């Protein structure tokens, strides 16, 4: 069960990093320029 848990964590990290980077970039864009479209994004 430890091996499959490690495999699941390895699979999760790759998918999590990209989405977190996208969300952080969206937040950075919103804070950089205050526009309603950036709010929606």
Residue of 36, 16, 14 lying closest to 24 (CA atoms): 16
**What is the C-alpha to C-alpha distance for residues 41 and 37, in angstroms, rounded to an integer?**
6
Quoted resolution (Å): 3.3
Task: Please state, in angstroms and as integers, the Cα–Cα distance from residue 31 to each residue in 7, 9, 11, 13, 16, following that order.
Answer: 36, 32, 31, 26, 22
Length, in residues, of the chain:
41
Instruction: Say if residues 16 and 4 touch (Cβ distance below 8 Å).
Output: no
Beta carbons within 8 Å of 38's beta carbon, 6+ residues apart: 26, 29, 30
């Amino acid at each position: 069960i430890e091996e499959q848990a490690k495999t699941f964590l390895d699979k999760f990290n790759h998918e999590a990093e990209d989405l977190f980077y996208q969300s952080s970039l969206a937040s950075w864009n919103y804070n950089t320029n205050i526009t309603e479209e950036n709010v929606q994004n």
